[PDB]
Amino acid sequence: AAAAAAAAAAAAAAAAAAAA
């Protein structure tokens, strides 16, 4: 009955802005 669970915070962005 061990437990280990973290939280994640890293980006899912890769896509670039529209119409600058």
Partner 1 sequence: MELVLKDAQSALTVSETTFGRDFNEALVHQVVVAYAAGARQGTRAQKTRAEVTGSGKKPWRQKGTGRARSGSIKSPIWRSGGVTFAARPQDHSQKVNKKMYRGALKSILSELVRQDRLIVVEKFSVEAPKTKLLAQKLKDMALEDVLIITGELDENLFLAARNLHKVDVRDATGIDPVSLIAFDKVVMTADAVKQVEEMLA
Tokens of 15: 């896509």
Least distance from RNA to the Cβ atom of residue 1, Å: 8
Instruction: Summarize as ranges the residues that interact with partner 1 (CB under 8 A).
Output: 7, 9-13
Residue 20, binding choice from RNA, partner 1, none, Cβ under 5 to 8 Å by partner class: none
Least distance from partner 1 to the Cβ atom of residue 6, Å: 12
Residue 18 DSSP code: S
* Residue 2 or 14 having the CB closest to RNA: 2
The conformational region for residue 9 under phi > 0 = left, psi -120 to 50 = alpha, else beta, is alpha
